[PDB]
Amino acid sequence: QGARQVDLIRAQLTRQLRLELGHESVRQARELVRNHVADQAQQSATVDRFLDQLDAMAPATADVDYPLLAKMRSASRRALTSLVDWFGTMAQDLDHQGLTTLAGELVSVARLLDREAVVTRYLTVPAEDATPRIRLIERLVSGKVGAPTLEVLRTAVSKRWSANSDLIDAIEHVSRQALLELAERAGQVDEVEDQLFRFSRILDVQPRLAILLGDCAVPAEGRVRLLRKVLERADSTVNPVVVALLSHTVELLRGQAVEEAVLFLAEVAVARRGEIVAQVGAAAELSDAQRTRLTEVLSRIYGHPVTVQLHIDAALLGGLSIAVGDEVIDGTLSSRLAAAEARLP
Amino acid sequence: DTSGRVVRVTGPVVDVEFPRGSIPELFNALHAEITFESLAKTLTLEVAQHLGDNLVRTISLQPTDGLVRGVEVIDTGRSISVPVGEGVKGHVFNALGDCLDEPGYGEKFEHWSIHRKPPAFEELEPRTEMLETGLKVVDLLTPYVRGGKIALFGGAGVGKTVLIQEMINRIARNFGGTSVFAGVGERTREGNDLWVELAEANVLKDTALVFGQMDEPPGTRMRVALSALTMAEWFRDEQGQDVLLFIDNIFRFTQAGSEVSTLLGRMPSAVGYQPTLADEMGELQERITSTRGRSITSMQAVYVPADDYTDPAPATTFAHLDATTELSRAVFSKGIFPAVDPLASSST
Amino acid sequence: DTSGRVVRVTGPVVDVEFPRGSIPELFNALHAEITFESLAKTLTLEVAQHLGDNLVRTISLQPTDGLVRGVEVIDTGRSISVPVGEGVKGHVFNALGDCLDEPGYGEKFEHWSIHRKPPAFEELEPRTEMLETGLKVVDLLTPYVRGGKIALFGGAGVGKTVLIQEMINRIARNFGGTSVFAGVGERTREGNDLWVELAEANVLKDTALVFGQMDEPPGTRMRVALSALTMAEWFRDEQGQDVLLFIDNIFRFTQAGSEVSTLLGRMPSAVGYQPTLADEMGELQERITSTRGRSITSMQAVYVPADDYTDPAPATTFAHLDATTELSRAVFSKGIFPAVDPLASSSTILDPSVVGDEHYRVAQEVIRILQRYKDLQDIIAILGIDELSEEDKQLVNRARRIERFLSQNMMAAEQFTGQPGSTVPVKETIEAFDRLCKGDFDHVPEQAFFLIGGLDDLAKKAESLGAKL
Amino acid sequence: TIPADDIQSAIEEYVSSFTADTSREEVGTVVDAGDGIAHVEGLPSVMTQELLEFPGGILGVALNLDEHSVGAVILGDFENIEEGQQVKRTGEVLSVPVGDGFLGRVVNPLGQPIDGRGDVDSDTRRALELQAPSVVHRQGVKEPLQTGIKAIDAMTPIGRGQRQLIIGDRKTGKTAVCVDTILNQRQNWESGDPKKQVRCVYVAIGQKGTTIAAVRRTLEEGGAMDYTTIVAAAASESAGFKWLAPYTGSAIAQHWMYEGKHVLIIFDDLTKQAEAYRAISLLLRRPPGREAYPGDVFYLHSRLLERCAKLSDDLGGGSLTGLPIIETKANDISAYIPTNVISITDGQCFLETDLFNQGVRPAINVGVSVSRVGGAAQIKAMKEVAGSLRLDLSQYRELEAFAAFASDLDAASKAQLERGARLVELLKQPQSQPMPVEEQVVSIFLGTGGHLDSVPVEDVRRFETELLDHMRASEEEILTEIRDSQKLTEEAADKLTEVIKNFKKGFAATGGGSVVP
Amino acid sequence: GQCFLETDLFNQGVRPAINVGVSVSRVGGAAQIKAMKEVAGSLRLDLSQY
Amino acid sequence: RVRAEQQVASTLQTAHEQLKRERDAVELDLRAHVGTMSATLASRILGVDL
Ligand SMILES: Nc1ncnc2c1ncn2[C@@H]1O[C@H](COP(=O)(O)OP(=O)(O)OP(=O)(O)O)[C@@H](O)[C@H]1O
Ligand SMILES: Nc1ncnc2c1ncn2[C@@H]1O[C@H](COP(=O)(O)OP(=O)(O)O)[C@@H](O)[C@H]1O
Ligand SMILES: [Mg+2]
Ligand SMILES: [Mg+2]
């Protein structure tokens, strides 16, 4: 047993040397690749290696992705989908100023139904004939609102809901859809998407602005005042529809983190066109040929047309890491270095 | 279409969401497949509660290890059904009606739901009748009741299995009847031993065995007695035959009910038994009775917690018992068989 | 910036909201301010749970009276740290590492975090060396272990503090290494008494004292044992010389964890304790140990709530110990001191291979006689000493003399009886109890065995009564 | 002698053989974390009991699944979990490496060595929750599993495939009984016969690490680590390790049982494993019941103890014998977990503190102790010499009140009193000193045949010791053919009586007298 | 320390009803004058043994 | 016994320092081989010889 003791301490020392030399060598390889990546053509080669690797993973089993029905527990998926199905034929005749006044009046109704929950309680009761609630509608705002806004409010109350707030979510979702329709008929069909995403990545860096926009007690007019000039600054916001979207969000957010709510907005915008968004990373900005290759190969991967975003960070040392849905394809050489350090004997 | 999907898995408790017009009735059996190759199986889920918003809470009868949220759940449209008929004699089943000694046997038999009502009030016998067994000590000092319940209080090495074989013989030969054994919370070693001993005594052909074992979730241990009693009820009513039902440690039925009540989040009762202790015990013991000339008599082993006869489980069980037979080791040592204690046993 | 904000204040539990990416790690120390002049202070908050949505549930180490929701909370980036090194000997410290003996002392020492993992399993080795004390009952029936774990179990007010001060007198005075005393949720009068008494005995210069008392909030009572343990662990792992660790009422540690349990959102366990009772007790008790070649002789007082030894807290403390001296209130009420229960106490080294054949045989015979006496006490109470056998009456007389000879005048009990204390060697103890078991003193009265030392005191007190050994 | 370039080229071939190609993986995010539990949004494809990988090489077990998050138990290093970390799927349920490389090692409840003696080469992996042998896949318990303790082997015999609960207050000798049982298989292992060899698994749940080290030292002093594995979940480990340790120790030793081998497993203080499961279940907010227990704790212990089985000859004929340990408080066997495990097992050895203090060691209450397998777990010699033992001891216990009234008793009653005193002194045994079955047969023959009626009560232990020494030295034929034939024929009994008489006329009592009748 | 008063001792006529065996003062003789500390030295232990 | 275990403790006293000498002797030797391991690790991470 003493011979066993000396042999086992010998082996322990050998194992210590094993792992120590391993960490030394992995640090050396990190050195080599970290001072070897500076060749931009080499970074492009890393990207193209990764994408030709992707060229064989096809396909994934990803199903449809919908922004808001994800959290709709029950009795509200049916409601919101019936509402959007009604809108699919209700909206095609409206005109631009019609849509903008519709959106304004809808977010006004949303702020109303938000400020006092006692009315929403008598407004979100389940009954296959809600003609008393329809009366309440016809005798609450009929002398103050337009015709199409009260019509969409009617067809909104016409269904049951899981809770009280989900109806407000549905209505402001309708306002979002209307603003996006106004933008789509304006020829800005996708400029709104990149605008939303870039503003989201801007707001992501500043937690101050982000969180204090989530002021659950400051007057909503105070919130929109907060948003006004930090949004109305320069050419960085040339889009004329995103102002109203972001205004609606920053006034009627209801506790949701603004950093998350604006990204939800962007995802709704990209989901209107039936497309998915994919948040990828790299070392530096791509060359748009790489963007085209990646976009079409990911659309083949997931069986749905996709659009990419680049949270560029040079701490990846090449490679890519897409983040479609909830499954990540990590191929950034940083993650591979971490893995090799973890698999060390 | 009309199938549900798993929403929550918390141990043996599974919540399932169905379409708006497809909610399964209470006690219905649902099927959900576990596809992990190491644990691949088909879970049976008994609907226990209607939670609202198209959610139902069910107790799983198999371990839910490997179950994924969102998998398809199929409603069978009926409660747990066991095979009934003459074909169940000489074979071993579980609380689900699956043949253990020959898998796939009995799948084409008639199947009866295990949740049944006791005989109507106008069908009950208003007159107590004694069961003439043929044993001197029983017929003299502790006469049994036809359609009644007999507590059995013997342990190991006192001839309890020999007495079970003896009663199987006497019901099969002196009454032209049948035996159903219910192992509630049965040890698999003792279940195999009972199987082998009945096959070697050539009385297995007269007995139908239903084993809900200890290594199973509480739902199976709670439903095995109802499965065996359903087989016995078919033998009594449809065949026209006096039946002898054997319940292994009726207490373990009470204990499995208490565990299922704890898993469903129900507030406990005095000492701790499920708030519906008396209701479940009555729903079980009232189906064991005489009706239309034929009867089911039941010998039940009773465990008394802490030797306290005022404990709620033995106190609720003894509200239905008609006789008591205590097998003594002092009598077994003197060579007297059956080792019935004449002074400790009794009859009402 | 990276600052937090107080959101909820419910007694000692404080909820704090941080910005995204600035959530503090678990067990980090945070600093908040109380500006009300009568209660102005700096609250230290230990991160206990991550609540989600950037919230964090923390426990305060000072009382939160005067704390306002919304004030700024600074993340220090590390756990609570205490000073370590040779410079902590001779001084009285806080649970946070602040010196009370001399405020500002140790601020520039090396600081160690109070949260550690226990030594690896391949570094542990069983300790089987007897530590001789001079108490007849401890030396005979519960021999202590050099570098092992010792505990004093007992209900409220039996002998625990007096016995642990007795062992500080007997073991730590002529000791050649370092001592660490942890006052964990105990009386401040006793802490001041111990401080003064170590100062007079010229033994304070080798002792480090860490006090968190009953008047402290549950956070201090949770972390003071970890602070003193960190000092002892430094003395073990870096200085490497023979530490002595005394912890007065380690139970208070456990009790503190149950005072904040439901406020942390934990469903209660059986007897009102936290569900993580055994897990926290294990992650603490497994650091109190000797490694291979690095000795820590530990001695803990364990409060037995309501005299119930089946209480979960002492019942799970039992499994962490090499020797346990168990004090009974039934022995206390009879006037026997130390109020040790000889039939409930144990020691792992009470083995013929360790203590010897004669030690072991005498201990076993003493225990057997006391067990037979306990069995006969009921008959003697109801039917009388007359309805017993001659052998049983002989055994009852021997057992009364034995249970009185197990008592002793202790050095730390002179303040209660006026009589000075006594030290008895273990060989004298074994030989005296062998004589008592054989029956060589069946003619000496029951008294003259009571609160004496060895056989010379036995002779003196017997002759002062009119008897001869 | 350092294998230098061995290490060099080893890590070199590893780093050259490192090609971790990048593929997709479904991930989630920690949303809250506290007290060893973490909730994870995402992971829609995760299954119940699936292992999860938290950053930093941390492992968790998905136990609670709902529409919002996955509640997982962290298996170690919980203080590293943070809100927002990325959790990965492993796609696998809890498994453990199995094989013969585990003999003589101390591992985690994960198959990872903690003794620091290198890697463990494993045959395969085995899932922790593989179902128990069916009711038709089994066989009657027929072979004895000798513990070496005369009280157990004579009164409450344990067979291969049986479960004998060891239940007692504390410091009553439960670990000593189980360690003596493990040490008693040393001769079986030395025989080299796979039909007689017993592999042992000691599971330590919630014990102080130095106590596990002391148990391992006791097993090493007796050559018992050649065939023993220790699964150690120390008191400092997480509640997940303390909950998984018996299932890990039972997954190992089921790989052996299904290979036709015979295994003995000890679950030291299953009470602590039930307490760990209760901690996990209360932290997961599952409904509590009596003593705050989850409500499937009976299932927790019965699922584990029904995997100890005696397999049929078609399945190989292997067996796994379980010796679970339960600590009671104040001798309360009507507590929840004691009641459950008494209900589950095939027999109980009750150990009392009072019996321990009276000198009865092992402190087994032979009156209430029971084995439901019984004489089917004994050889014929033991079945024959110990049949007159239980009634004798019960008569002695009934007559103990008349100790000082022998002259006022029937001659038969005084004979029963003296015989019972001798038999109580005969069932005593030192710690870590198990006896082979032939010597236990000779000892119980000395007792029940009457050859101790002439020896003083205070000399029975020494008489039995010296007689067994004599027979080991001089008359090895009796022991040898008892061991070979498993019975005590009439000629062996005659030679035994002759040897006993010669020894008696040679033996010297402590009172100076003669033990000759 | 505690002064434990009992109704059984009160009814017996022992008044004050202090149970001397379980009553104690943790300060002890330091809370007395020297005369009282020297005359009532082991009075509590004497009464407990009695 | 005591002779054997104390003298194997002596053999441990010797072997510990001997093997530590071997270890810190090879510690300087292994550093010559770190470069090739680094190069091949980088080559496998990227996929080209550089
Ligand atoms: N047969 C025996 N003869 C003499 N002494 C014994 C015997 N069995 C055990 N002991 C002694 O009893 C003491 C406690 O026994 P053991 O530790 O085995 O009990 P346990 O059931 O493990 O209790 P715990 O788990 O609380 O420690 C040990 O120090 C051991 O020396
Ligand atoms: N050995 C002893 N001799 C005399 N009196 C004692 C002895 N031990 C304790 N006492 C008395 O009993 C009381 C017990 O106090 P202590 O044991 O310190 O309380 P605790 O056990 O709660 O810490 C003391 O105040 C003292 O008066
Ligand atoms: Mg105290
Ligand atoms: Mg033990």
Determine the distance separating the centroid of ligand 4 and the alpha carbon of D302, expressed in angstroms: 22
- Please, which residues have CB within 8 angstroms of residue C175's CB and are 6 or more apart in sequence? C206, C242, C244
Among chain D residues, CA nearest to B308: D334
DSSP state of D34: E
- Please, which residues have CB within 8 angstroms of residue D32's CB and are 6 or more apart in sequence? C49, C50, C51, C52, D38, D39, D83
CB C367 within 8 A of CB C141: yes
CB A301 within 8 A of CB A57: yes
Distance (Å, whole) CA B177 – CA B232: 10
Q: Which of A225, B289, B189 is nearest to D133 (CA)?
A: B189
CB D276 within 8 A of CB D205: yes
Distance (Å, whole) CA D453 – CA D447: 8
Q: Report how far apart, in Å, the C-alpha atoms of A165 and of each of A120, A157, A220, B291 are.
A: 8, 13, 17, 59
CB D285 within 8 A of CB C267: yes
The residue nearest atom 10 of ligand 1, judged by CA position, is D173
**Other C-beta atoms within 10 Å of F29: how many?**
11
CB A102 within 8 A of CB A178: yes
DSSP states along B242-261: -EEEEETTHHHHHHHHHHHH
Q: Resolution limit in angstroms?
A: 2.6
Distance (Å, whole) CA A37 – CA A315: 11
Counting beta carbons within 10 angstroms of the beta carbon of residue A35, is it exposed (0 to 12), middle (13 to 18) or buried (19 or more)? exposed
How many residues would you count in chain B? Answer: 348
**Other C-beta atoms within 10 Å of C77: how many?**
11
Dump strand ranges (E) for D24-120. Answer: 25-34, 37-42, 50-54, 58-65, 70-74, 86-93, 95-98, 106-107
Structure-token pair, residue B340: 């019935």
Q: Is B200 among the residues known to form the active site?
A: no
Pocket flag, ligand 1, residue D488 (CB < 6 Å): no
Helix (H, G, I), strand (E, B) or coil at C105: coil
CB D282 within 8 A of CB D275: no
Q: Binding residue per annotation — C76?
A: no
Pure H helices in D432-489: 437-449, 460-473, 476-485
CB C286 within 8 A of CB D206: no
Note whether A24 contacts F: Cβ–Cβ < 8 A. yes
Shortest CB distance from F44 goes to which of D4, D8, D16? D16
Distance (Å, whole) CA D309 – CA D263: 10
* A287 phi/psi in degrees, rounded to 5: -105, 125
DSSP states along A289-340: HHHHHHHHHHHHHHTS-EEEEE---GGG-S--EE--TTEEEE--HHHHHHHH
Q: Is the peptide bond before C338 cis (omega within 30 degrees of 0)?
A: yes
* Angle at CA of residue D66, ends D60 and D69, nearest 5°: 55
Pocket flag, ligand 1, residue D174 (CB < 6 Å): yes
Structure-token pair, residue D396: 């002695």
Structure-token pair, residue A66: 């919908």
What b/e string do you get for A39-58 counting C-beta neighbours within 10 Å, with b at 16 or more? eeebbbebbebbbebbeeee
Determine the distance separating the centroid of ligand 3 and the alpha carbon of C246, expressed in angstroms: 12
Pocket flag, ligand 1, residue D150 (CB < 6 Å): no
Structure-token pair, residue C132: 């001789």
- Measured torsion, CA atoms of residues C443, C449, C454, C456, in degrees rounded to the nearest 10: -60
DSSP state of D260: T
Distance (Å, whole) CA C236 – CA D336: 42
Q: Binding residue per annotation — D19?
A: no
Which H/E stretch holds residue B180?
A: strand B178-186
Q: Which of C256, C255, C321 is nearest to C282 (CA)?
A: C321
Report, as residue numbers or ranges, the catalytic residues of D.
372
Asked if A28 and F34 come within 8 Å (Cβ–Cβ), the reply is yes
Nearest ligand to the C-alpha atom of residue C418: 2
Q: Report how far apart, in Å, the C-alpha atoms of A75 and of each of A78, A79, A282, B53 are.
A: 6, 6, 42, 7
- Please, which residues have CB within 8 angstroms of residue E12's CB and are 6 or more apart in sequence? none
Distance (Å, whole) CA C151 – CA C29: 31
* D402 phi/psi in degrees, rounded to 5: -100, 35
CB B50 within 8 A of CB B78: no
Distance (Å, whole) CA C138 – CA C126: 20
CB D227 within 8 A of CB D199: yes
CB C20 within 8 A of CB A259: yes
The residue nearest atom 21 of ligand 1, judged by CA position, is D174
Q: Is the peptide bond before C342 cis (omega within 30 degrees of 0)?
A: no
From chain B, which residues contact A within 8 Å (Cβ)?
17, 20, 53-55
Pocket flag, ligand 2, residue E24 (CB < 6 Å): yes
Note whether D4 contacts F: Cβ–Cβ < 8 A. yes
Distance (Å, whole) CA E25 – CA E42: 13
Structure-token pair, residue B13: 């408790």
Distance (Å, whole) CA C177 – CA C235: 9
Pocket flag, ligand 2, residue C416 (CB < 6 Å): yes
Q: Binding residue per annotation — D169?
A: yes
Residue B49 pairs in a beta bridge with B57
* C432 phi/psi in degrees, rounded to 5: -65, -45
Distance (Å, whole) CA B180 – CA B233: 10
CB D159 within 8 A of CB D374: no
**Other C-beta atoms within 10 Å of D133: how many?**
26
- Please, which residues have CB within 8 angstroms of residue D463's CB and are 6 or more apart in sequence? D446, D452, D455, D507, D515
Q: Report how far apart, in Å, the C-alpha atoms of C148 and of each of C145, C252, C278, D219, D513 are.
A: 5, 22, 20, 21, 46
- What 3 state SS string does D358-409 have? CCCCCCECCCCCEECCHHHHCCHHHHHHCCCCHHHHHHHHHHHHHHHHHHHC
* Residue D105 identity (one-letter amino acid): R
Which of A330, A336, A341 to mutate to test binding with chain D, by most D CBs within 10 Å of its CB? A330
Determine the distance separating the centroid of ligand 2 and the alpha carbon of C416, expressed in angstroms: 8
Residue D274 CA, chain-centre distance (Å), reads 17
Asked if C335 and E49 come within 8 Å (Cβ–Cβ), the reply is yes
Distance (Å, whole) CA E1 – CA D503: 65
Helix (H, G, I), strand (E, B) or coil at C4: strand
- In chain A, residues with a C-beta closer than 8 Å to the C-beta of C3 are none
Distance (Å, whole) CA D105 – CA D111: 10
Asked if D2 and F22 come within 8 Å (Cβ–Cβ), the reply is yes
Pocket flag, ligand 2, residue E21 (CB < 6 Å): no
Atom of ligand 2 nearest to the CA of C248: 23
Shortest CB distance from D136 goes to which of B101, B216, B306? B101
Helix (H, G, I), strand (E, B) or coil at B56: strand
**Other C-beta atoms within 10 Å of C320: how many?**
26
- In chain C, residues with a C-beta closer than 8 Å to the C-beta of E38 are 418
CB B221 within 8 A of CB B212: yes
